[PDB]
Design a protein around this ligand. Sequence first.
Ligand code: MG
Ligand code: MG
Ligand code: MG
Ligand code: MG
Ligand code: MG
Ligand code: MG
Ligand code: MG
Ligand code: MG
Ligand code: MG
Ligand code: MG
Ligand code: MG
Ligand code: MG
Ligand code: MG
Ligand code: MG
Ligand code: MG
Ligand code: MG
Ligand code: MG
Ligand code: MG
Ligand code: MG
Ligand code: MG
Ligand code: MG
Ligand code: MG
Ligand code: MG
Ligand code: MG
Ligand code: MG
Ligand code: MG
Ligand code: MG
Ligand code: MG
Ligand code: MG
Ligand code: MG
Ligand code: MG
Ligand code: MG
Ligand code: MG
Lengths: 384, 61, 129
Amino acid sequence: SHRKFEHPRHGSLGFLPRKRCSRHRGKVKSFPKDDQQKPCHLTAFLGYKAGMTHIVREVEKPGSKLHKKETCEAVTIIETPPLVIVGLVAYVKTPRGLRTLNSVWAQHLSEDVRRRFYKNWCKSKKKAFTKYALKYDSDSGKKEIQLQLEKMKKYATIVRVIAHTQIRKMKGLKQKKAHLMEIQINGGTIADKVDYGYKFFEKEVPVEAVFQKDEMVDIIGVTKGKGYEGVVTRWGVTRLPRKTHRGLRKVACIGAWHPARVSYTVARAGQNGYHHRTEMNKKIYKMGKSGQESHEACTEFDRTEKDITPMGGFPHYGVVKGDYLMIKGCCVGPKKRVVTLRQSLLKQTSRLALEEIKLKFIDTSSKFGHGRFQTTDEKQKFYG
Amino acid sequence: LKTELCRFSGQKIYPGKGIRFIRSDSQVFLFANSKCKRYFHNRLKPAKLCWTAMYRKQHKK
Amino acid sequence: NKFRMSLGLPVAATVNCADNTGAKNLYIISVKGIKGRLNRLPSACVGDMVMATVKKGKPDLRKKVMPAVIVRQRKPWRRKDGVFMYFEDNAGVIVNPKGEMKGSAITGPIGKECADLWPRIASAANAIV
RNA sequence: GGUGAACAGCCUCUGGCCAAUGGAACAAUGUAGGCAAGGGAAGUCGGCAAAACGGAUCCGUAACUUCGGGAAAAGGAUUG
RNA sequence: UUGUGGCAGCCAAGCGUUCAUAGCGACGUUGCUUUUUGAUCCUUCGAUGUCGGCUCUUCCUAUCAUUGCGAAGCAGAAUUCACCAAGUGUUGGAUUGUUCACCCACCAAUAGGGAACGUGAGCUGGGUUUAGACCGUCGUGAGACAGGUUAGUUUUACCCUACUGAUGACAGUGUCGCGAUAGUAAUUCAACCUAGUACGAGAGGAACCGUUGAUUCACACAAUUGGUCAUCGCGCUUGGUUGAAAAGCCAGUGGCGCGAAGCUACCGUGUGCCGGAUUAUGACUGAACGCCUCUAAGUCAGAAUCCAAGCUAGCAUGCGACG
Ligand SMILES: [Mg+2]
Ligand SMILES: [Mg+2]
Ligand SMILES: [Mg+2]
Ligand SMILES: [Mg+2]
Ligand SMILES: [Mg+2]
Ligand SMILES: [Mg+2]
Ligand SMILES: [Mg+2]
Ligand SMILES: [Mg+2]
Ligand SMILES: [Mg+2]
Ligand SMILES: [Mg+2]
Ligand SMILES: [Mg+2]
Ligand SMILES: [Mg+2]
Ligand SMILES: [Mg+2]
Ligand SMILES: [Mg+2]
Ligand SMILES: [Mg+2]
Ligand SMILES: [Mg+2]
Ligand SMILES: [Mg+2]
Ligand SMILES: [Mg+2]
Ligand SMILES: [Mg+2]
Ligand SMILES: [Mg+2]
Ligand SMILES: [Mg+2]
Ligand SMILES: [Mg+2]
Ligand SMILES: [Mg+2]
Ligand SMILES: [Mg+2]
Ligand SMILES: [Mg+2]
Ligand SMILES: [Mg+2]
Ligand SMILES: [Mg+2]
Ligand SMILES: [Mg+2]
Ligand SMILES: [Mg+2]
Ligand SMILES: [Mg+2]
Ligand SMILES: [Mg+2]
Ligand SMILES: [Mg+2]
Ligand SMILES: [Mg+2]
């Protein structure tokens, strides 16, 4: 009663339970190990997957057949307007784990970030932080806020900033309620970290101050939801012969007689998609900052003046008007989903990681139908 | 930039796109999209299809 | 070496013979390099060396297993500049285990992924595309 | 009545009905019906199931035969 | 239970061109195993669905390949014996209902087994295993056949549990966090360089680093390519029908061509992970035993291993900081 012929198991037991994620925003489940000699930097952002397109670039990779040749590659655009830092949180090492010691918020919080604390903003009184705000206008109150900073400097082993997105600057997102997270400050001492975070309250962080060009980043987020799915698509098992009574799309035997139970290893039907995932080593091909030539889609080889947004806009997204980021390959989530960009935990040393990218062409033809023009005036002047 | 032309419909083909057919006589046909490709293999004549580049020069449109 | 291409030709696929050997028609029975997987048929693509029989052609070539190289496939495949290129027919040529062609001439176009991987076929090729 | 060789199938007139519990939504698994690149029975006990063929006009039709057949053999061309 | 089946020991007459023990091992002898069969008749005859295959998962080691080693009648290449080791893998077919077998072919390899001889409210029904029928042998005959042949119904889940997912109460309500525990995942090959180098009379003929690829798997995603149509989107068309034209409708999607969008394919694209402790083994120091000795005390290097990290869950009826 050994199986006659062997084949590897279908599906991975390492991503169980394959249930709906408990989170819409992706959760950073580990930050890069700290290096106190580095200056105080941040380690993550919240972006919005806008869409995909493709480049054509030319390779430099001696020994590869692609050397001195062209290549076409899919890329994903993530719109990443500046983050706004509203708070600071300190952590202390305890025998059970890490613990929040205290936290200080900024005086002025926008309506967007304050929407985060309500489940019906409109019919509330909008009182959140209306009394914590008064701590900034009395010398006894200022004394506390300053004293809380001293306590973080005195005992913290880890410092994080609270930041929210400027959700209002993406009109294609019909959202006013900003997304809020904690982003760890690496480098410098705890005294350096607290000064770096508080000094920079109520202000904006571009994506440039954290991520660079040609560096490898992890992308975190929740995958597309597909509802309740059977075993053939959910797990990838083979179909049964055509002439089976009661259906093809199942697993024929779900276990032996003993143990007299169904094991957790057998494939079952259930939720497919909307799962948390961390995806590593997505390379950065281009940083687009509003107000410089690096924002538009004009290379050194192609000078046709055009914007990154394809004709007719990114489908189901809108128009990318702010800072954005160009990643090699595909991105977790549907369009409009908030994604967590995180600095790599690993050391990047391989030749792919160090490789320098020079684009030659960015396709801005329409992603509806078979796009055939790169700009609208190209289209208009073609016809009439 | 280095554009390329559709053998059927006579439109510009931009980098990273197109379908390249090789016929037995070693003649290379490059199509812009699958609409052109299926009409070609159905043996339509791009001079009889109103939206083609060959048709428009033939009727001075 | 070479990049990975859409495999067009499983075993039992029957292919045209593009050389002046007298074989008309090759019949793929396996593919060199295929470490299998339960129920999956070994498949070939342009530049893949295969084992085949001759089902039409001269008497002295039939009823023998022999090595061949695929040169043309109808299945589209993605070139690494982005295009999806394909041929009108499936074709291969008779070779030795060392790749030496049994015949002397090739009739028709030849996939570039094959010519750069088999220099003796490259020599006999008419137009490498 | 029309199409057509046709009491075939398909649509219509006379006459007869809309009687089969309704509403919302469109997951898995079913059941009934489709389509699928490249390959073409490798599937399977087994081509099971499906696909391919199909009307008419012209041409052409082998073995074998109880000389009656086989035969609509096979193989071609045409069709508004 | 272990005769029989399978695996393994001890002694050593001999083989191994000389040499009992590199590799073997006669005559003898000691065991283990429970995928065979035999023996038995303890359970079940107010019924535990009875071969095989397909499907899927898990487990063992008596290790085939893959990692690290020790020995050789180990020059190199290949091969053989042994150890630690079950982490990963073990295929496509012709014939047969077959398990078994045997060839073809690829491969790093095509190891061996268990789970009610796993698995029929999972399938299938080829075999076997009722009733029809033919042959051969037997029988006076009805009929028999552990002989061959052909045709012969495969029922039920809505219960409990298990499993997979989905809500959810228990310090007001909300946001941001911590992380006990549970799961876990990556895999193997090839080309170039080393290199016609080491080794060798020649014949032959390696490897580490470095580089570039590919296989099996996993997780995503849809810019491009391919697939999908009832966008009933546009076009054409058979039959009918509204007197005609125009516009339509019916033939359950009338039919054909193209067909966005969405979904989706190794048929498309991207990504897949760093510390520590050690095993086998080789060593250091160093007595027992003036020498010696990897061992006694004390140290070291060390793996496809284990534990971490990382990744998934986290109602842990656990906890923190704030509004
Ligand atoms: Mg079994
Ligand atoms: Mg096995
Ligand atoms: Mg998938
Ligand atoms: Mg049935
Ligand atoms: Mg599109
Ligand atoms: Mg199989
Ligand atoms: Mg008539
Ligand atoms: Mg009639
Ligand atoms: Mg097909
Ligand atoms: Mg068959
Ligand atoms: Mg068969
Ligand atoms: Mg088979
Ligand atoms: Mg058979
Ligand atoms: Mg049939
Ligand atoms: Mg006949
Ligand atoms: Mg025994
Ligand atoms: Mg015995
Ligand atoms: Mg009894
Ligand atoms: Mg008994
Ligand atoms: Mg009984
Ligand atoms: Mg019963
Ligand atoms: Mg009973
Ligand atoms: Mg039972
Ligand atoms: Mg062992
Ligand atoms: Mg059962
Ligand atoms: Mg039967
Ligand atoms: Mg009978
Ligand atoms: Mg009988
Ligand atoms: Mg049921
Ligand atoms: Mg664990
Ligand atoms: Mg398409
Ligand atoms: Mg589509
Ligand atoms: Mg020493």
